[PDB]
């Protein structure tokens, strides 16, 4: 079963702005996704201090960056807390409404798209480089889900039948045809050292076979 949902109007407007605005400094998407992964790793680590069983789904706390030339994808994998079905459909978007409005107003007052993370909605910077984003996620005591959207005002959620992940999130960026530089090892290394060099979890940049 695939369920299709409409974005909140403000989120759809944000996605259109990210897709349509002329803005050359697209590389900031990676720092935003790595920051989200780091936040998710912080959360599971904190919760494990009072409930060690929360790591029964995996003790390693890390971030992997995986390019695929065959699929034209860059995947950001973390073993953080993961997202529930309710997170994916309702709750993260409810939280994001506030930051979206503030970000859009800041842009009209002279802010820049690279500041998106200061409003807590940096996930959507993925659409600077991706025509479609697939999110595979697994939270303890919920199922493994695939969320997906090519924008246009809707997203889907389904139970995921792929390789079980244990716990965490994979953000699969289906890159636009002109954004394949983000598959290059040298380019990702440059961006990670520029914007994400103090993240408190190991970041492994996989190499393409
Ligand atoms: C899927 C769309 C709707 C989305 C993604 C985000 C950012 N985000 C919130 N919780 C997260 C966790 Cl637990 N892990 C990671 N990696 N990112 C997270 O917010 N909305
Ligand atoms: C694991 C948790 C603490 C977390 C928080 C974030 C920040 N963040 C980035 N983009 C977001 C969107 Cl679009 N929505 C919402 N609600 N939060 C977003 O990322 N992960």
User: Residue written as tokens 């009209």?
Assistant: 108
Own/partner contacts of 197-203, CB < 8 Å, gap of 24 or more, are: 199/34, 199/35, 199/38, 199/63, 200/38, 200/42, 201/37, 201/38, 201/41, 201/61, 201/62, 201/63, 201/78, 202/62, 202/63, 203/34, 203/62, 203/63, 203/64, 203/65
Short-list 146, 126, 128, CA closest to 136: 146
Tell me how far apart the alpha carbons of residues 209 and 205 are, in angstroms, rounded to a whole number: 13
Tell me how far apart the alpha carbons of residues 168 and 163 are, in angstroms, rounded to a whole number: 13
In units of Å, what resolution does this entry have?
1.3
Structure tokens at 162: 């792929």
Nearest 5°: phi and psi at 157? -135, 135
Ligand 1 atom at minimum distance from 83 CA:
13
Using the mean position of ligand 1's atoms as its centre, give its distance from the Cα of residue 171 in Å: 9
Using the mean position of ligand 2's atoms as its centre, give its distance from the Cα of residue 74 in Å: 19
What residue segments make up the domains of the chain, in order of their start?
1-209
Tell me how far apart the alpha carbons of residues 209 and 201 are, in angstroms, rounded to a whole number: 25
Ligand 2 atom at minimum distance from 80 CA:
1
For a pocket test of ligand 1, which of 92, 96, 156 has the largest count of ligand atoms closer than 8 A to its C-beta? 92
Ligand 2 atom at minimum distance from 83 CA:
1
Nearest 5°: phi and psi at 120? 80, 20
Tell me how far apart the alpha carbons of residues 16 and 134 are, in angstroms, rounded to a whole number: 18
Tell me how far apart the alpha carbons of residues 45 and 127 are, in angstroms, rounded to a whole number: 29
């Amino acid at each position: 079963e695939v369920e299709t949902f409409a974005f909140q109007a403000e989120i759809a407007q944000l996605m259109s702005l990210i897709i349509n605005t002329f803005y050359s400094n697209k590389e900031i998407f990676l720092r935003e996704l790595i920051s989200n992964s780091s936040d998710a790793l912080d959360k599971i680590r904190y919760e494990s201090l009072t409930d060690p069983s929360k790591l029964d789904s995996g003790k390693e706390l890390h971030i992997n960056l995986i390019p695929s030339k065959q699929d034209r994808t860059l995947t950001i994998v973390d073993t953080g807390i993961g997202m529930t079905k309710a997170d994916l459909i309702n709750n993260l978007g409810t939280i994001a409404k506030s930051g979206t409005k503030a970000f859009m107003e800041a842009l009209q007052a002279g802010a820049d798209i690279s500041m998106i993370g200061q409003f807590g909605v940096g996930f959507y910077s993925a659409y600077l480089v991706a025509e479609k984003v697939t999110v595979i996620t697994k939270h303890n005591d919920d199922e493994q889900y695939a969320w997906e959207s090519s924008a246009g005002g809707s997203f889907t959620v389904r139970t995921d039948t792929g390789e079980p992940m244990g716990r965490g999130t994979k953000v699969i960026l289906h890159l636009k045809e002109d954004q394949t530089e983000y598959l290059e090892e040298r380019r990702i290394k440059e961006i990670v050292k520029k914007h994400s060099q103090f993240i408190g979890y190991p970041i492994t940049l996989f190499v393409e076979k």
